[PDB]
Short mmCIF file of C-alpha atoms and ligand atoms in Angstrom, two decimals:
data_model
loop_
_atom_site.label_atom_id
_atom_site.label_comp_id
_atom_site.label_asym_id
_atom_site.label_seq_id
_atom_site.Cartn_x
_atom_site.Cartn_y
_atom_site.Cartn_z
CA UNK N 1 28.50 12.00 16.04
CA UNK N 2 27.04 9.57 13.25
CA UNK N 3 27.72 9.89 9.58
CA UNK N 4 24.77 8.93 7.27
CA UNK N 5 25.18 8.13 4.20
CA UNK N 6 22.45 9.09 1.09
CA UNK N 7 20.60 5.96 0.00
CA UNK N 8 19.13 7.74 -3.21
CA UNK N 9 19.70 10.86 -5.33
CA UNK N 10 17.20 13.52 -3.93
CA UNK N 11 16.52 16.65 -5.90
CA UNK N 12 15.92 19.73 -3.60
CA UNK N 13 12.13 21.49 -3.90
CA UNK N 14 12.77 24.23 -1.57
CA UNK N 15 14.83 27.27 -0.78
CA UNK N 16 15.83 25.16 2.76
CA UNK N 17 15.96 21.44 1.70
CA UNK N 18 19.75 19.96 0.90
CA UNK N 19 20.05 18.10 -2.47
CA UNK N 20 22.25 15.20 -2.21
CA UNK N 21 23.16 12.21 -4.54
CA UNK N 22 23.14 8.39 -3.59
CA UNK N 23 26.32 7.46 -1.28
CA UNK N 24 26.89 11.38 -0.10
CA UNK N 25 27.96 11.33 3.50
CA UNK N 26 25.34 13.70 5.72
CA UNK N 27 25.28 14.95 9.37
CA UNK N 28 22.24 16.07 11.33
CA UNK N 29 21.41 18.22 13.85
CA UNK N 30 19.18 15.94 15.68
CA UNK N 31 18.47 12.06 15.37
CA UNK N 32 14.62 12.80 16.01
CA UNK N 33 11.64 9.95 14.66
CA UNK N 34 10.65 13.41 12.37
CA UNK N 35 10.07 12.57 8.91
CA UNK N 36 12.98 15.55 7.98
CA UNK N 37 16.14 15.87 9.83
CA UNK N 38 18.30 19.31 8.99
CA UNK N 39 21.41 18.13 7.88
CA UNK N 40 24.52 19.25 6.08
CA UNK N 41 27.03 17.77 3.57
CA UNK N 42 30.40 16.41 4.36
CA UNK N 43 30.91 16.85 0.37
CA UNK N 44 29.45 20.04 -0.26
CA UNK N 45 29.78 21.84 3.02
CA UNK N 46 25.95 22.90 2.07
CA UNK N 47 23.10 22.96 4.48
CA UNK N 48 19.30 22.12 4.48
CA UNK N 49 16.36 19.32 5.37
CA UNK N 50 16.87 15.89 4.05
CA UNK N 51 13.90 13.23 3.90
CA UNK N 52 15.11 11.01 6.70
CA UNK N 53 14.14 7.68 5.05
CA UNK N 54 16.49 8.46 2.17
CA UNK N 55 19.78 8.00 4.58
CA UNK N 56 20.71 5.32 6.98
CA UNK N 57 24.21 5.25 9.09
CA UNK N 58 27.52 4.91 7.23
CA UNK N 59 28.42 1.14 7.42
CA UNK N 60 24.97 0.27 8.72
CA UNK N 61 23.36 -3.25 7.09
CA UNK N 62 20.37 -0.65 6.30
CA UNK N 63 23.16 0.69 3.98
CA UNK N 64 23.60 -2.21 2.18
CA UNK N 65 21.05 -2.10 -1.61
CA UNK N 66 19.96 -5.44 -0.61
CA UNK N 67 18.88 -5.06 2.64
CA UNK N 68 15.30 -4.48 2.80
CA UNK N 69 14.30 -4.23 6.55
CA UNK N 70 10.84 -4.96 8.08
CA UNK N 71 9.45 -6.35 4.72
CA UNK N 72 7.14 -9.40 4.37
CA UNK N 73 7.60 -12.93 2.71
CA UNK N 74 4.72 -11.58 0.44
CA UNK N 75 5.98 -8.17 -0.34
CA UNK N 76 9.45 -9.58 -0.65
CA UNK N 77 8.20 -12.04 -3.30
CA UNK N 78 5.98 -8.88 -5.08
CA UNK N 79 9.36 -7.60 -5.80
CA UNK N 80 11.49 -10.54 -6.43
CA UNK N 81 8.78 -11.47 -8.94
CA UNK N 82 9.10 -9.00 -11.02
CA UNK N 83 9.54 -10.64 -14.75
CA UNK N 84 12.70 -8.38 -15.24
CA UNK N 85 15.04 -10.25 -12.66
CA UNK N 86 17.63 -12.82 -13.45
CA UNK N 87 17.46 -15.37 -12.07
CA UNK N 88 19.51 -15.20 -8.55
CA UNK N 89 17.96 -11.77 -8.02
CA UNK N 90 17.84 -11.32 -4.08
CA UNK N 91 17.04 -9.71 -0.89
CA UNK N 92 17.75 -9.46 2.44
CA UNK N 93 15.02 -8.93 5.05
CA UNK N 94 14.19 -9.60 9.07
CA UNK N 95 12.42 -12.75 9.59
CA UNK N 96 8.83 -12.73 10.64
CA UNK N 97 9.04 -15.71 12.15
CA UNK N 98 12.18 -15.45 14.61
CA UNK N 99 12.83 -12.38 16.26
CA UNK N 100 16.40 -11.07 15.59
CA UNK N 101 17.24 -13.46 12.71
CA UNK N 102 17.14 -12.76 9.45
CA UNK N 103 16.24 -14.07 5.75
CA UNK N 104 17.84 -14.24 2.79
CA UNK N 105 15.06 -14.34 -0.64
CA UNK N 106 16.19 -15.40 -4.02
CA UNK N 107 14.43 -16.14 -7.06
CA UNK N 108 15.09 -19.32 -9.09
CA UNK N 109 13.56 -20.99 -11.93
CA UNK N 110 13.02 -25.07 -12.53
CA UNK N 111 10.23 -26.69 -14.45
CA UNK N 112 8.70 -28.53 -11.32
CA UNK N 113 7.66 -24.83 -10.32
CA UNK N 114 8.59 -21.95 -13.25
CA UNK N 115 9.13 -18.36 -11.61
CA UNK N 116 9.65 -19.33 -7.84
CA UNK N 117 11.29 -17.40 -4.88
CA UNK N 118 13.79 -19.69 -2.32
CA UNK N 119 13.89 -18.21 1.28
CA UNK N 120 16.21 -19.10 3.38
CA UNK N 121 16.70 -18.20 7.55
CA UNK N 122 19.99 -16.45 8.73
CA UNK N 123 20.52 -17.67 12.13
CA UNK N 124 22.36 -14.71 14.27
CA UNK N 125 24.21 -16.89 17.14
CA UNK N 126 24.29 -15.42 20.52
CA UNK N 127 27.62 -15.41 20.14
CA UNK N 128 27.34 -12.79 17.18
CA UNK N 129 28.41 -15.26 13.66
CA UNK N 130 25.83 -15.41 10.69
CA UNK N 131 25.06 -18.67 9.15
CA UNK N 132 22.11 -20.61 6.73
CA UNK N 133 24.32 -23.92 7.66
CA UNK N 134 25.96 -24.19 10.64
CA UNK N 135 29.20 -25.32 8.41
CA UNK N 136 29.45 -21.78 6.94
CA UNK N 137 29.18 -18.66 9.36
CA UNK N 138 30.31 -15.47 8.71
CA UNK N 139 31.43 -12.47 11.37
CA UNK N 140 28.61 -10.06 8.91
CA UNK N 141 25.54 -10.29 6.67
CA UNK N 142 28.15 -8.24 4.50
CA UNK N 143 29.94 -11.50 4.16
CA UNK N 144 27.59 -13.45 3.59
CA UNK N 145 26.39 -11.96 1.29
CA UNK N 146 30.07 -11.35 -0.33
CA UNK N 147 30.37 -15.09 -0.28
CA UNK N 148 27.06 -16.75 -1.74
CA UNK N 149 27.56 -13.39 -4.72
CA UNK N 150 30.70 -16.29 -5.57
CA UNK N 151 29.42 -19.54 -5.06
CA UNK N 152 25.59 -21.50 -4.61
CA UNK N 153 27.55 -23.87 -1.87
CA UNK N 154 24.17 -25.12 -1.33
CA UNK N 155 21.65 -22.37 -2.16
CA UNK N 156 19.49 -22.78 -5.28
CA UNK N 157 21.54 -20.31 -6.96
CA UNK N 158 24.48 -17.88 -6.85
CA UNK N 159 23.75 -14.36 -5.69
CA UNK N 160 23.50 -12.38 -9.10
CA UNK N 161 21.35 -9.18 -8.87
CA UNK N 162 20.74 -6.90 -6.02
CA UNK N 163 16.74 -6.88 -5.81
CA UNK N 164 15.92 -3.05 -7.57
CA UNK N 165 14.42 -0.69 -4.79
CA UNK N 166 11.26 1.89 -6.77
CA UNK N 167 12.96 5.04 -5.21
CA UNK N 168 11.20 5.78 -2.09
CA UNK N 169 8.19 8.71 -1.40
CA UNK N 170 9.27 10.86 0.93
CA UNK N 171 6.98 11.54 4.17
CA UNK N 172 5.39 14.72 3.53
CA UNK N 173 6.31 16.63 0.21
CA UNK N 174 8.87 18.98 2.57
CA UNK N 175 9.00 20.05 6.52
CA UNK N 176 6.40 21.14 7.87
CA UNK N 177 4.47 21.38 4.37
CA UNK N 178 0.72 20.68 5.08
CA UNK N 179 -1.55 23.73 3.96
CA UNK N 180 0.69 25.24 0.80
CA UNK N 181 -0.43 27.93 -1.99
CA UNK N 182 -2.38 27.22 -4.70
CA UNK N 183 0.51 27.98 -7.04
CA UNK N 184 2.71 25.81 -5.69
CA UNK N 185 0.12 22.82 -7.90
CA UNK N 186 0.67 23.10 -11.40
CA UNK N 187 -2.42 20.18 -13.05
CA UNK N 188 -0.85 18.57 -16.18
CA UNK N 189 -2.86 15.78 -16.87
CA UNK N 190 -6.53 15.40 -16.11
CA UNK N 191 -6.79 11.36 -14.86
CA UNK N 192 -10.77 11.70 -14.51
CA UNK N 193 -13.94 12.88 -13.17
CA UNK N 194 -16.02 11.78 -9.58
CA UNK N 195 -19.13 12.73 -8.30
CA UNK N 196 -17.47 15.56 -6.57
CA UNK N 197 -14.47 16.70 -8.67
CA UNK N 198 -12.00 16.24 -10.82
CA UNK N 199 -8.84 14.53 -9.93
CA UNK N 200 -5.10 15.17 -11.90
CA UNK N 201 -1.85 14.16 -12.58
CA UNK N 202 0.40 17.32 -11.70
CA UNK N 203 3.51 18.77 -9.90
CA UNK N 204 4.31 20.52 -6.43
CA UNK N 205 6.85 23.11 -6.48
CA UNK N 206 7.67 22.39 -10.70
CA UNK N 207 9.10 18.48 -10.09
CA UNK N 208 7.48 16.30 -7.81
CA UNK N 209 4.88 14.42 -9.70
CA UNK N 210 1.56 14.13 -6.93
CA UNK N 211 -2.22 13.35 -7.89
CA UNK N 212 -4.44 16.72 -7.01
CA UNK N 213 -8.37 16.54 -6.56
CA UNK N 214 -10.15 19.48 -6.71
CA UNK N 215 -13.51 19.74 -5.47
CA UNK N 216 -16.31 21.76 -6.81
CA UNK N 217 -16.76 24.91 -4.48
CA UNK N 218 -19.70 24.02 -1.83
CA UNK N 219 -18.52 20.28 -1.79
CA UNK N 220 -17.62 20.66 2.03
CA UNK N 221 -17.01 23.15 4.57
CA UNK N 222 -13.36 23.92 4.53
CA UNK N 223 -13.32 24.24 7.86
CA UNK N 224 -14.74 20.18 8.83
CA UNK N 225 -12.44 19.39 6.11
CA UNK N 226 -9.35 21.15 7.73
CA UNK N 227 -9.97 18.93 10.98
CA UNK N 228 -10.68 15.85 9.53
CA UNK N 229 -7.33 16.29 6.98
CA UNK N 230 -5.11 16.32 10.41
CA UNK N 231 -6.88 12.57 11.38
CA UNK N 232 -6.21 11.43 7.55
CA UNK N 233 -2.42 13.13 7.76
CA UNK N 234 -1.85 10.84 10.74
CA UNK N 235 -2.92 7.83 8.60
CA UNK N 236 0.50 6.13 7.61
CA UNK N 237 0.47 2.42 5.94
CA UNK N 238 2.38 0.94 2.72
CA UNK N 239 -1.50 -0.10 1.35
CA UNK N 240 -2.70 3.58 1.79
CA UNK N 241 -2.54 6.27 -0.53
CA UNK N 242 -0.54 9.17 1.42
CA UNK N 243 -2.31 12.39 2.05
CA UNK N 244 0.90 14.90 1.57
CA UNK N 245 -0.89 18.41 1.49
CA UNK N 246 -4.09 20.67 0.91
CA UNK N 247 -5.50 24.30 -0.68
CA UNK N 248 -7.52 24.72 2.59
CA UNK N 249 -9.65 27.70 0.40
CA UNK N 250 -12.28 26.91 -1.82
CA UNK N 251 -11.92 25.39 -4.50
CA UNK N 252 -10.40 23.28 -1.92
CA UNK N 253 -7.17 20.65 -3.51
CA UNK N 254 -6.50 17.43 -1.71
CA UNK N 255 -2.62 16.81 -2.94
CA UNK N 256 -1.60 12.86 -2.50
CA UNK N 257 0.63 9.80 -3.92
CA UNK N 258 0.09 9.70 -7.96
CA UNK N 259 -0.87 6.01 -8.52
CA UNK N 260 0.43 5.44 -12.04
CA UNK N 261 -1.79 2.18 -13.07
CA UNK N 262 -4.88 4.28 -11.95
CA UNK N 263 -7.74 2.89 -10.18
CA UNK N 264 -8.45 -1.22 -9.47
CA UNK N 265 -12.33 -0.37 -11.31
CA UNK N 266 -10.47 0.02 -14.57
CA UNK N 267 -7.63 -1.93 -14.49
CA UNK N 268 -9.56 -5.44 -14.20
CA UNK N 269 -11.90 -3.68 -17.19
CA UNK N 270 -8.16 -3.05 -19.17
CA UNK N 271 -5.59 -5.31 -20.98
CA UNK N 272 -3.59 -6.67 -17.84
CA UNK N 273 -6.80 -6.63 -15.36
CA UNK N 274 -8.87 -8.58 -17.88
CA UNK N 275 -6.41 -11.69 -18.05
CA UNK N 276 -5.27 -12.13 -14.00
CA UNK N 277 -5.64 -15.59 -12.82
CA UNK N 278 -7.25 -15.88 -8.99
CA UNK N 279 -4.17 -16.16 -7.33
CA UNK N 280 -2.90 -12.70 -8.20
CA UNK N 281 -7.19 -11.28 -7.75
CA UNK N 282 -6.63 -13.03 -4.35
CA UNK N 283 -3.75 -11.21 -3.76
CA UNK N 284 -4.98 -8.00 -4.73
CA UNK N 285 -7.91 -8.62 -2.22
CA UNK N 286 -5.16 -9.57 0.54
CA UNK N 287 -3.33 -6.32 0.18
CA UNK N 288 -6.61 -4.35 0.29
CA UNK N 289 -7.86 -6.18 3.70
CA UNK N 290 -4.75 -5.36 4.91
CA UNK N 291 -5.11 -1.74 4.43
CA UNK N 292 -8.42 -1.56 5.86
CA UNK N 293 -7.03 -3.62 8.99
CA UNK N 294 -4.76 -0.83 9.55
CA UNK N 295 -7.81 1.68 9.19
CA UNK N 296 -9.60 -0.63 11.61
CA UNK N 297 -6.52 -0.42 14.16
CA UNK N 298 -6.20 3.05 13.48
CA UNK N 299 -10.30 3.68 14.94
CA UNK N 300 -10.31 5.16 11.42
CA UNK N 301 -13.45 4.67 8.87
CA UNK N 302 -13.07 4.45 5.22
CA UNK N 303 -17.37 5.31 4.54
CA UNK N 304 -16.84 4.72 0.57
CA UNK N 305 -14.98 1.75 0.29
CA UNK N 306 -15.34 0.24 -3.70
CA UNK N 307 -12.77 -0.79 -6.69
CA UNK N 308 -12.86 2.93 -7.49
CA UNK N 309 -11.12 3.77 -4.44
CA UNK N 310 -8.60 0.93 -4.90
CA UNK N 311 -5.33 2.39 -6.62
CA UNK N 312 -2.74 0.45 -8.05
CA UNK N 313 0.51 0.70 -8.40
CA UNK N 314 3.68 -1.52 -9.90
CA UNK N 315 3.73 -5.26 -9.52
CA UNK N 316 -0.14 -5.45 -8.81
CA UNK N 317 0.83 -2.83 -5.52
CA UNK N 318 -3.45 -2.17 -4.49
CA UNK N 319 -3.87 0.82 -2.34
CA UNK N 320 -6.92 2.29 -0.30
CA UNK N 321 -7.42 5.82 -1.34
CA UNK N 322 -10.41 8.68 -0.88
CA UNK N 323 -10.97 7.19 3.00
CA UNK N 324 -12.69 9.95 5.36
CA UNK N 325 -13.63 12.46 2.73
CA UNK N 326 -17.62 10.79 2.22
CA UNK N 327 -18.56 11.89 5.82
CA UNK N 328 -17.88 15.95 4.65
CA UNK N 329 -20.13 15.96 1.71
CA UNK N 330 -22.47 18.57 2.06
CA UNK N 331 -25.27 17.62 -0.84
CA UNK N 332 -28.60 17.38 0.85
CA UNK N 333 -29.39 13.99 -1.03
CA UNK N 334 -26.01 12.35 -0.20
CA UNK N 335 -25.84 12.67 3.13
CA UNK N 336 -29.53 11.33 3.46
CA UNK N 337 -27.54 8.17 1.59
CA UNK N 338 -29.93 9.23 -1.51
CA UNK N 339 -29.25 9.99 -5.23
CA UNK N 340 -27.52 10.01 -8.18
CA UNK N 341 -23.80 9.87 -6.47
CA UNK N 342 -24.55 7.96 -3.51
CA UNK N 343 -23.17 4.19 -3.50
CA UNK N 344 -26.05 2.28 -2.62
CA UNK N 345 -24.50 -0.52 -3.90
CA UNK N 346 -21.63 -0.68 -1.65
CA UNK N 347 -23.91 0.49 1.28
CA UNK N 348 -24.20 -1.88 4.78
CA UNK N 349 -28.01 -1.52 5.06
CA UNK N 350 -27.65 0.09 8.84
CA UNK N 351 -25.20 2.82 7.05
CA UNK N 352 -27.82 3.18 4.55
CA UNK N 353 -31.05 3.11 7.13
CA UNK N 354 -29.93 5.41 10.05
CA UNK N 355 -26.49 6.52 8.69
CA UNK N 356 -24.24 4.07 11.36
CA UNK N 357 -21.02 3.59 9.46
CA UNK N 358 -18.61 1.95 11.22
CA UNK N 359 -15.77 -0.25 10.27
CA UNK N 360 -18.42 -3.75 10.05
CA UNK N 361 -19.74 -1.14 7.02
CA UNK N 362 -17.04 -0.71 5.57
CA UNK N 363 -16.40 -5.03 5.99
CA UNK N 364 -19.94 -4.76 4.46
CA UNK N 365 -18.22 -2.10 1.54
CA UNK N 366 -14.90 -4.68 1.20
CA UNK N 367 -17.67 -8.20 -0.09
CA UNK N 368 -18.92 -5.59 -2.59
CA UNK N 369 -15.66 -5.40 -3.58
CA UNK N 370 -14.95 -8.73 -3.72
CA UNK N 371 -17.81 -9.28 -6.25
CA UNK N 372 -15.81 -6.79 -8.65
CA UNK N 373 -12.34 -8.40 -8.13
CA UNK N 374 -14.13 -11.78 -9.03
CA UNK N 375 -16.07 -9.97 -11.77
CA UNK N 376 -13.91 -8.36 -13.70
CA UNK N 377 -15.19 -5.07 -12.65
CA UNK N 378 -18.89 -5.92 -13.03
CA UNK N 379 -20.95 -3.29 -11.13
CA UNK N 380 -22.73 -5.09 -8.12
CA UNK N 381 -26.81 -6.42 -8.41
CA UNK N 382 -26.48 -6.30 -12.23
CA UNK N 383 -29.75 -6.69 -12.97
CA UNK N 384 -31.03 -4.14 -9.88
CA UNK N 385 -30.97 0.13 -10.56
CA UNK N 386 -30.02 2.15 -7.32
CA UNK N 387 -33.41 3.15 -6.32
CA UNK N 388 -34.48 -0.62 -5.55
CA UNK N 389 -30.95 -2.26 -3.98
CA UNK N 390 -31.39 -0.72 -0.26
CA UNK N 391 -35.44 -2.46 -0.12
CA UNK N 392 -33.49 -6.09 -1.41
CA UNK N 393 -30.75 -6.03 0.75
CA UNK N 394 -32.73 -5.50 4.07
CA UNK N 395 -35.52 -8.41 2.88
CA UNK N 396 -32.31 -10.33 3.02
CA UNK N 397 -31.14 -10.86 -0.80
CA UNK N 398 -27.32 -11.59 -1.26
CA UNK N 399 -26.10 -11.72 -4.51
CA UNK N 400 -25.22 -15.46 -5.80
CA UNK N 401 -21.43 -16.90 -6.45
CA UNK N 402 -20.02 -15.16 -9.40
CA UNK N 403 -19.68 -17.31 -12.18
CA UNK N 404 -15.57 -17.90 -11.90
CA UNK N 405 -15.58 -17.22 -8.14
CA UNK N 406 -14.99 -20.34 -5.88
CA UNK N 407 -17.61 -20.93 -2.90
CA UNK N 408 -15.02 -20.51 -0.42
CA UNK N 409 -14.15 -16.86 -1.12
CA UNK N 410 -18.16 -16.47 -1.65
CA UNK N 411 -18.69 -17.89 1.99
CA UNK N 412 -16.50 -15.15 2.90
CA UNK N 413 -18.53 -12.31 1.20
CA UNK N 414 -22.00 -13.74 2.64
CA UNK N 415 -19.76 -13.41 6.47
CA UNK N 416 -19.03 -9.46 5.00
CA UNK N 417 -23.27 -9.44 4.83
CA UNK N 418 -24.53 -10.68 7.95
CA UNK N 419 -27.39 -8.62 8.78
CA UNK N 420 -25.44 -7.95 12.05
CA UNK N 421 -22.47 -5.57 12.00
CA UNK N 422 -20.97 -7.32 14.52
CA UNK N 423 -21.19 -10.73 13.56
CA UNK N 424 -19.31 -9.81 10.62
CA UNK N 425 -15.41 -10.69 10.38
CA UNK N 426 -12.35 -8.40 11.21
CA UNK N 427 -10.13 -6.75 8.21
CA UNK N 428 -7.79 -8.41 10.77
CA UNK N 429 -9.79 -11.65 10.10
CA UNK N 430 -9.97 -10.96 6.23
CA UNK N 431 -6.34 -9.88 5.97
CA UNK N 432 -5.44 -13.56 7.79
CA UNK N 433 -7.99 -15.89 5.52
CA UNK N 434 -6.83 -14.22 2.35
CA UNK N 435 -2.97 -14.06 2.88
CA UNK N 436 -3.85 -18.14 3.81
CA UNK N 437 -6.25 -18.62 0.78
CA UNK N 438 -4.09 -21.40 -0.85
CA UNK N 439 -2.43 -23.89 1.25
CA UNK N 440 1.09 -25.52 0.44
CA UNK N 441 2.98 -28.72 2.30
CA UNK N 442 5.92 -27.26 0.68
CA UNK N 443 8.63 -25.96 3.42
CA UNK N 444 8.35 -22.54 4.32
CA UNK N 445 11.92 -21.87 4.59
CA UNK N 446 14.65 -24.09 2.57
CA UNK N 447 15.82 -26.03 6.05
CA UNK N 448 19.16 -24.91 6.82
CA UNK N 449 20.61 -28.42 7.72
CA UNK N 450 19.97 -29.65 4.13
N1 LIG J 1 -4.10 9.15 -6.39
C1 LIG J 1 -4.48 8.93 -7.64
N2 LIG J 1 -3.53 8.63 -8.56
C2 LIG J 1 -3.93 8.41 -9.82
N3 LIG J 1 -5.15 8.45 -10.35
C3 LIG J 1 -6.07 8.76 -9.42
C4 LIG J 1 -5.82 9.01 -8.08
N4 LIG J 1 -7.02 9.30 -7.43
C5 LIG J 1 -7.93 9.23 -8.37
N5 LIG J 1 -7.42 8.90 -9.60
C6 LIG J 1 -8.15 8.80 -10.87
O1 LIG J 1 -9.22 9.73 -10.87
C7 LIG J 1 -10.47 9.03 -11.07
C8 LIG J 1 -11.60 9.76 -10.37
O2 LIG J 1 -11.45 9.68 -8.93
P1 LIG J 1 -12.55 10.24 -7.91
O3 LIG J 1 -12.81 11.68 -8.22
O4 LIG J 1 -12.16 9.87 -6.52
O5 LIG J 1 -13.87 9.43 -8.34
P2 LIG J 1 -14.44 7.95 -8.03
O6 LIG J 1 -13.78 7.55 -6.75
O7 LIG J 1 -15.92 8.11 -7.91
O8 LIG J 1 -14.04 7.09 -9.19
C9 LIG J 1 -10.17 7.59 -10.63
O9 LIG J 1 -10.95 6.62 -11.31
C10 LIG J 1 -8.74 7.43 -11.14
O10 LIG J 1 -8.73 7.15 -12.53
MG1 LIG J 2 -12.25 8.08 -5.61
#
């Protein structure tokens, strides 16, 4: 029988969850891939469902506050970034490179570079020992991480600060919650107005803050909505916004993640947005391919892809939200891709003509997008209203390099507006080029033989 142990405080939002604090020790009822595992408390004897990514096995690595699991070089450095850190603030992740080894991340500081993040490979022998040097191996990454907390011994820097982990969302706002009473929402804080609703900052169940849009009644059939919400629920990826429940009865409420920087439209027309250098716009763009790659390997389509559906979050965090919900709107005028609300702008002419959305639109959708990124928020064809972009765009016209936008990433829009859908590249293509954008002979790793 294993003994998990609580990796955070959670606060219980039901009458058959289990409230725990961080280091409780918990046993479950079944080890199942389930998002909730019923558990009880070897402290309080009590009983209930526990989010399951909130507890890992006693005296597991995935125990340990520095160990981060399955995260990337990139996301790693997001974090380790962050201007609050200390210098020797550190991780420890899987490699991506070498299966079954490991990496520690650190961030330093030195003139030559500023604000910089060292990574360095942990070797696992064969034989079981831990090492960054062959000269020093330890029997656990517990130890190793023990020892280089007391001395550099070749490392830029001595292990100071355990990287801090933004408490986790849990999957789902409880088990088995999906369709939930109308009272369950109370709306606190109105965060705009769309086309199609309003959207607001709120709670489920009095204290779990969650964004709520609320569509006007004869927006779309409940019914198409109820089927295309189980697609959307299975839709799962750390650049997504999650989908955690619905009011299935008009006026229908589509409950998901609260994104507390608000939407990427405003944020580059705001005080931070207005300021970012390319390198951080290019990373914004990175994370937001690599959203829509996982829509693309998901057979999913997104259908109203623009900044305003770009969410962001801490530490320049970019999410995809309002994917699937374009295809249900009922108005007459939108669905002939006509009017006021429609986004012509952001429209792949063969969406636009004869209403084939596919992923290549949505590529189509993501160089509109690039044009705002590079733009501070401009709105697309400047100079063009609505009524005359679709009559342009199939003569062929392209709108020219922004003014502060290199060639190279406008190459890459004019490949997002081939005429042909298919001739236009992959998210899994855009995800690669933009992750690669700036090139470095510097070492990868720090080599371990010095
Ligand atoms: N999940 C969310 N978290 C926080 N703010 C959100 C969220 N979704 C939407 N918003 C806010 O609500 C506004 C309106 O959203 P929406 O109704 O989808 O309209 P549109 O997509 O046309 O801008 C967004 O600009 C943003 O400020
Ligand atoms: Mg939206």
């Amino acid at each position: 029988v294993t003994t998990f142990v609580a990796l955070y405080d959670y606060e219980s939002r039901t009458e058959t969850d289990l409230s725990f604090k961080k280091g409780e020790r918990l046993q479950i009822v079944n080890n199942t891939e389930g998002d909730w595992w019923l558990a009880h408390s070897l402290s309080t004897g009590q009983t209930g469902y526990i989010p399951s990514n909130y507890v890992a096995p006693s005296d597991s690595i995935q125990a340990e506050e520095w160990y981060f699991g399955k995260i990337t070089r990139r996301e790693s450095e997001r974090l380790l970034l962050n201007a609050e850190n200390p210098r020797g603030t550190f991780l420890v992740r899987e490699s991506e490179t070498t299966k079954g080894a490991y990496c520690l991340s650190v961030s330093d500081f030195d003139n030559a570079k500023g604000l910089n993040v060292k990574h360095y490979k942990i070797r696992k022998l064969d034989s079981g020992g831990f090492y960054i040097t062959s000269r020093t191996q330890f029997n656990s990454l517990q130890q190793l991480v023990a020892y280089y907390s007391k001395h550099a011994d070749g490392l830029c820097h001595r292990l100071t600060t355990v990287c801090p982990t933004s408490k986790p969302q849990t999957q789902g706002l409880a088990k088995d919650a999906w369709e939930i009473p109308r009272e369950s929402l109370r709306l606190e804080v109105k965060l705009g107005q769309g086309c199609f609703g309003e959207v607001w900052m709120g709670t489920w169940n009095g204290t779990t803050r969650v964004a709520i849009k609320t569509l006007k009644p004869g927006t779309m059939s409940p019914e198409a909505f109820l089927q295309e919400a189980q697609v959307m629920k299975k839709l799962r990826h750390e650049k997504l916004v999650q989908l955690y429940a619905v009011v299935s009865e008009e006026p229908i409420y589509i409950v998901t993640e609260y994104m507390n920087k608000g939407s990427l439209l405003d944020f580059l027309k705001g005080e931070t947005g207005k300021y970012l250098r390319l390198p951080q716009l290019v990373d914004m763009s990175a994370q937001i391919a690599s959203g829509m790659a996982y829509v693309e390997r998901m057979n999913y389509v997104h259908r109203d892809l623009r900044a305003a559906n770009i969410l962001v979050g801490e530490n320049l965090v970019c999410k995809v939200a309002d994917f699937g919900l374009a295809r249900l709107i009922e108005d007459n005028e939108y669905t002939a891709r006509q009017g006021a609300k429609f986004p012509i702008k952001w429209t792949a002419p063969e969406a636009a003509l004869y209403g084939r959305f596919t992923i290549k639109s949505d590529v189509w959708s993501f160089g509109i997008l690039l044009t705002e990124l590079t733009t501070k928020g401009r709105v697309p064809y400047p100079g063009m209203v609505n009524r005359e972009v679709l009559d342009q765009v199939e003569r062929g016209y392209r709108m020219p390099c922004p003014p502060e936008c290199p060639e190279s990433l406008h190459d890459l829009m004019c490949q997002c507006w081939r005429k042909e859908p298919e001739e236009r590249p992959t998210f899994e293509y855009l995800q690669a080029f933009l992750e690669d954008y700036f090139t470095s002979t510097e070492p990868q790793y720090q080599p371990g033989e010095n």
